[PDB]
Amino acid sequence: QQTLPVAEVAQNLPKKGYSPFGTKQSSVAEWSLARLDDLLNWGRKGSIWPLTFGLACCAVEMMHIAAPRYDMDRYGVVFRASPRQADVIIVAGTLTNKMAPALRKVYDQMPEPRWVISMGSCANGGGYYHYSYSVVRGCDRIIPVDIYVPGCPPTAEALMYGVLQLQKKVKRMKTLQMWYRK
Amino acid sequence: MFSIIFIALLILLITTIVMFLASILSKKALIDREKSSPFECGFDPKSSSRLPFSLRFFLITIIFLIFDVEIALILPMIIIMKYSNIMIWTITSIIFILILLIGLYHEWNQGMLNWSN
Amino acid sequence: LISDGSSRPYRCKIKAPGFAHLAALEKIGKQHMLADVVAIIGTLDVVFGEIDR
Amino acid sequence: EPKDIVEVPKGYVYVNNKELSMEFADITDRAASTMFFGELLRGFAVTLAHIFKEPATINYPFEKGPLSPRFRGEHALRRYPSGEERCIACKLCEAICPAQAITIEAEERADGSRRTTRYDIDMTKCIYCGFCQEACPVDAIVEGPNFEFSTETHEELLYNKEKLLCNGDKWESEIASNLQADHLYR
Amino acid sequence: MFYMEFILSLIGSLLLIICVLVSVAFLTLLERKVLGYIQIRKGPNKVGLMGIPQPFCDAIKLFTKEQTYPLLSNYLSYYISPIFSLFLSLFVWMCMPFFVKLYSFNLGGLFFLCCTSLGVYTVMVAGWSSNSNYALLGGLRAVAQTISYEVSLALILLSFIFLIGSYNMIYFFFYQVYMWFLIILFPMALVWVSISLAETNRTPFDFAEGESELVSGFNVEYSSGGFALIFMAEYASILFMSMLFCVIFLGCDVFNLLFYMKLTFISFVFIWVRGTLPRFRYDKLMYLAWKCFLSFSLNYLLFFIGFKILLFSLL
Amino acid sequence: MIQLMLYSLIITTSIIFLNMIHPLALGLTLLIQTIFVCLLTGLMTKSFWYSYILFLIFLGGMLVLFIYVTSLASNEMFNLSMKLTLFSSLILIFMLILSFIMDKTSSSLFLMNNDMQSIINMNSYFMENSLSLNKLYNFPTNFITILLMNYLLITLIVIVKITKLFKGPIRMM
Amino acid sequence: PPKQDLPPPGGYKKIPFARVPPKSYFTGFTTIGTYVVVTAVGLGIYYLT
Ligand SMILES: COC1=C(OC)C(=O)C(C/C=C(\C)CC/C=C(\C)CC/C=C(\C)CC/C=C(\C)CC/C=C(\C)CC/C=C(/C)CC/C=C(\C)CC/C=C(\C)CCC=C(C)C)=C(C)C1=O
Ligand code: SF4
Ligand code: SF4
Numbered sequence A: 001q002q003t004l005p006v007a008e009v010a011q012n013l014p015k016k017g018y019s020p021f022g023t024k025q026s027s028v029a030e031w032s033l034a035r036l037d038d039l040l041n042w043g044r045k046g047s048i049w050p051l052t053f054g055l056a057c058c059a060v061e062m063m064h065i066a067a068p069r070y071d072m073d074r075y076g077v078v079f080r081a082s083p084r085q086a087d088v089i090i091v092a093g094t095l096t097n098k099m100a101p102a103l104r105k106v107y108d109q110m111p112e113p114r115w116v117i118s119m120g121s122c123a124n125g126g127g128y129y130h131y132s133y134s135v136v137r138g139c140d141r142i143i144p145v146d147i148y149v150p151g152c153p154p155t156a157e158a159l160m161y162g163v164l165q166l167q168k169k170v171k172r173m174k175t176l177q178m179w180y181r182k
Numbered sequence B: 001m002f003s004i005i006f007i008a009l010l011i012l013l014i015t016t017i018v019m020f021l022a023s024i025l026s027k028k029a030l031i032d033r034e035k036s037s038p039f040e041c042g043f044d045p046k047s048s049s050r051l052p053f054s055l056r057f058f059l060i061t062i063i064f065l066i067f068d069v070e071i072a073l074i075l076p077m078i079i080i081m082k083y084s085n086i087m088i089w090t091i092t093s094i095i096f097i098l099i100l101l102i103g104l105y106h107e108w109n110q111g112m113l114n115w116s117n
Numbered sequence C: 001l002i003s004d005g006s007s008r009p010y011r012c013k014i015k016a017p018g019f020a021h022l023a024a025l026e027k028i029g030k031q032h033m034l035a036d037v038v039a040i041i042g043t044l045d046v047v048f049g050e051i052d053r
Numbered sequence D: 001e002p003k004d005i006v007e008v009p010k011g012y013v014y015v016n017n018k019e020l021s022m023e024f025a026d027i028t029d030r031a032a033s034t035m036f037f038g039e040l041l042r043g044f045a046v047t048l049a050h051i052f053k054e055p056a057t058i059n060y061p062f063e064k065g066p067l068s069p070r071f072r073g074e075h076a077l078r079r080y081p082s083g084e085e086r087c088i089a090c091k092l093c094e095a096i097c098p099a100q101a102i103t104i105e106a107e108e109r110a111d112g113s114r115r116t117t118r119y120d121i122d123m124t125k126c127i128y129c130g131f132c133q134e135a136c137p138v139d140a141i142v143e144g145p146n147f148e149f150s151t152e153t154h155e156e157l158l159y160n161k162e163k164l165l166c167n168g169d170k171w172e173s174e175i176a177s178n179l180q181a182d183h184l185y186r
Numbered sequence E: 001m002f003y004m005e006f007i008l009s010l011i012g013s014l015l016l017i018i019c020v021l022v023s024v025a026f027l028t029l030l031e032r033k034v035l036g037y038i039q040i041r042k043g044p045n046k047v048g049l050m051g052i053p054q055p056f057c058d059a060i061k062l063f064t065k066e067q068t069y070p071l072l073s074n075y076l077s078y079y080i081s082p083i084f085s086l087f088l089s090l091f092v093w094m095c096m097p098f099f100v101k102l103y104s105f106n107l108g109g110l111f112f113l114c115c116t117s118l119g120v121y122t123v124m125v126a127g128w129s130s131n132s133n134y135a136l137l138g139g140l141r142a143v144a145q146t147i148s149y150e151v152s153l154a155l156i157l158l159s160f161i162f163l164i165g166s167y168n169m170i171y172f173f174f175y176q177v178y179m180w181f182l183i184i185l186f187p188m189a190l191v192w193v194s195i196s197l198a199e200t201n202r203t204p205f206d207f208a209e210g211e212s213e214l215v216s217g218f219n220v221e222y223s224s225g226g227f228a229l230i231f232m233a234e235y236a237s238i239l240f241m242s243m244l245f246c247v248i249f250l251g252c253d254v255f256n257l258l259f260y261m262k263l264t265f266i267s268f269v270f271i272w273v274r275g276t277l278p279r280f281r282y283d284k285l286m287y288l289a290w291k292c293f294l295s296f297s298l299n300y301l302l303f304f305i306g307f308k309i310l311l312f313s314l315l
Numbered sequence F: 001m002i003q004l005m006l007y008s009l010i011i012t013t014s015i016i017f018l019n020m021i022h023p024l025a026l027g028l029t030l031l032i033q034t035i036f037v038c039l040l041t042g043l044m045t046k047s048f049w050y051s052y053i054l055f056l057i058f059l060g061g062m063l064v065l066f067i068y069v070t071s072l073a074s075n076e077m078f079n080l081s082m083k084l085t086l087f088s089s090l091i092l093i094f095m096l097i098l099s100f101i102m103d104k105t106s107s108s109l110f111l112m113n114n115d116m117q118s119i120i121n122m123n124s125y126f127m128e129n130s131l132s133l134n135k136l137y138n139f140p141t142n143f144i145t146i147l148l149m150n151y152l153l154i155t156l157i158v159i160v161k162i163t164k165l166f167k168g169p170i171r172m173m
Numbered sequence G: 001p002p003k004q005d006l007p008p009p010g011g012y013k014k015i016p017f018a019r020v021p022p023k024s025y026f027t028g029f030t031t032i033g034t035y036v037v038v039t040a041v042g043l044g045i046y047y048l049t
């Protein structure tokens, strides 16, 4: 595994910079799109609206992320009810067969760009009920998953770390910069 | 007026431009047969929204039409207090508000203000 | 709980306190509107997973 | 004070038992609150008072925790100070794992020591119960302190022995400190 | 000269429009911080510097997000309803009194009554146009709100009007030069805030949205573009109605600075209440308006008809 | 000038109103026209006081009939009529063309606006609506207002008796 | 020094569980009486205006 740089070696490395695309763009047009691409990502990154799914006993720890101790809202994360206004879905709990068509539909109704987070073992791979006769073995069978948060339930910080991974994943989208090459 | 109409149009144009920007600035993806389906908590809907929706405050609904048209007759009061005969203005105004209260309390006591049960 | 002398339970039935509570929701909230039914659902004090074994 | 509609026996407390007085001194008191929003007034004082408290939020990730040495997190295969792996493929952990998240295949090593050629944990099936670390007779498998290992792919959540061994080296210092401060209870 | 005069009137409206549009963005942040502090939370603190650019950081998302074309909706109605919701919210500001003239508006008090009533259709049409069960319930939950507050609203305005002598809002300044009508009209101030909440559909009167009774009310079927304007139109209503409380009960010194310190405070009160009270029950409101408020308001017309008459004899 | 264009629109919206079938299509047409008629009336008067009142009165009636439309005629259909859109748009532009080339001193209504009044008219320097609404509350015409009051209250007794609330809600069975 | 989590020598103090109501400043007569006075003075100053 790639280990972190030592202090002395890191003592020379240049400051990272904010944009993951750097300021090394050859042309003006490319550079403007790169900077303009950051503006989109800065927007979507800032305000990520979950859907308030809350299926099973991960759902309780999905409340304590909104509790004052950790305060999801500090990061611009605001819970919402309608899937139209919701941007992210946190599938937290055991997605049984009876639910499975309902999650698919609710996910479909969510407008793009939509990212899915899988909370806990139940939604990751079927978890403790993996072999049950009425459990979908992981929600990735039904909807694409963008971040997997392990745990049972994941700690509140663990989910917070998951959300920040989604911000970083959002931060590095190349929606515009890849249109130029296309 | 004519000033207000012009700004009324100018605002409407401006607000209209806002979505006309949103409609283009919006990310565009192929629409799915399920993406545009209605939202009813993730399960297909049994009943169209265009079925007859029963009503229970119908009686109040009609009383609302009335009570407004007496708001047309109280509003002019102030404007004509300096200019009117005080007895006629005083007497008539009171027997205007007593009539309203008596009407209200009469129905309240008869239980019409309560919803259909 | 039933045991058959083995290392594993033979059968484990689990009473959910909310099971009875939700069965009665058919009548308790009858002739009430959504704001009341939403209130009743909370006061029934039903944590699902109990009801769904 | 008003009286109780139902007399109360011993060892029981009633919530709505006191009746309502009908003395003008009290009816006016109820009337005044019902008439000037008196009940809601104190409700507004309380909420405003909370503006003047330090909020309990933590500036994660710069500040975080607190936890305890017993915390159950990501797994890791420890090894002896010599460097030799502790696990001897006894397979108690596999047999006790409620989720059947562990798979082990063992073989007589070249030097002849009982050891594993395979040790896989399916982190999307584990429940972080901690029975594996209680059953291991040589403390080979432990649930390390780490709880920040979310991935972007399902496959990366299936740990094989090399991944588990790497954790047991990255996290070795902290695990050895938790075991020392906690083994006596266990 | 005269040709120049109306040019300035355009500038004022545009200046007032952009300033109100900007403020409702920052009001939404203020709502989240304050509501985040009444709750022991911290509120938005990371984005940009100390959270100040948060509302702009959200306006990006709601516009780079796709429109939703509901399958069973009359699309043209569904698509236009957001426009008129925002238009009616901004348009009602042209009557806000300025001593540096913007619009004369004799009978300005009435112009309030007309415009606020219109705000119900936009909710009403949006809910019905969406053609979803919840959306329709939201719309008809909003209409029933009007049936309640509408009549009592006019009467309570009439009481304030008797004090000043005319429907021109400017006169509120002259009569509130020594003191504030809050003292004379304390129960009405308390009642007026209550009706003001119904106007803007806020907790404890949040029925059009109806969060946790209806999934999202009449907004349940809106998305990036339409939903944003519905949102901004909502908070523009709060800002104006908060100001209208400041011109009636709190001095109406529009040219003084403190008037704007007051204006934000009443805006804080609207957030403050949202973090205190649970929502009323859909029927209890309509009973409240007709059983108590309407009877209450009529009672003081007599009190102020007598008081004005008595005062007229002396003066 | 806009008076003629108001004439064109009120005519245009009336032509289509004859052709509406869906109740809500009728309502939208009617609501738009209530705006124009309200606007137009205040042009030929000393004040817009009555336009405010008329607008406020009708909006009360607008909401109520939606409540009943949404309960009785909920399930009905629209049909865009290309004949209608062309016809209205055809005449509308045609009418708008005339208003530009019209002797619009001749088309203006002779009713005396407030400014149209002389400067000597001493009664025109009072409050905007003082005199006009005055004798609504003075002897002898005040009794007419009183007569309305019973008429309105007696009406309030008629609806409850016609309605017979206690025998149920209203549904389009 | 105890070798196990145990109550201290002499035990913990008593834990408050009962309900304590907040301070009451206003009664029916004082509230109704004050309002009339406040309104009356309000009319008094209003007249001068
Ligand atoms: C878990 O338990 C819980 C629940 O149960 C589920 C809850 O429901 C809830 C519910 C919470 C609430 C209801 C909180 C209130 C929040 C909401 C109702 C919605 C959430 C959204 C917000 C708070 C954000 C507020 C703002 C908006 C929605 C958008 C409004 C529109 C805005 C700001 C745009 C204003 C217009 C302007 C012109 C401003 C100035 C300029 C801009 C914006 C331009 C931006 C950028 C550009 C033009 C790019 C230019 C670039 C270049 C030229 C290079 C909680 C708290 C909870 O804890
Ligand atoms: S993963 Fe664990 S905590 Fe989450 S729902 Fe399943 S059993 Fe409960
Ligand atoms: S913690 Fe429990 S479920 Fe997870 S691997 Fe260990 S024994 Fe199995």
Ligand code: SF4
Pocket: D086, D087, D088, D089, D090, D091, D092, D093, D094, D104, D135, D136, D137, D138, D139, D140, D141
């Ligand atoms: S219980 Fe310990 S020694 Fe036995 S197989 Fe598992 S990890 Fe290895």
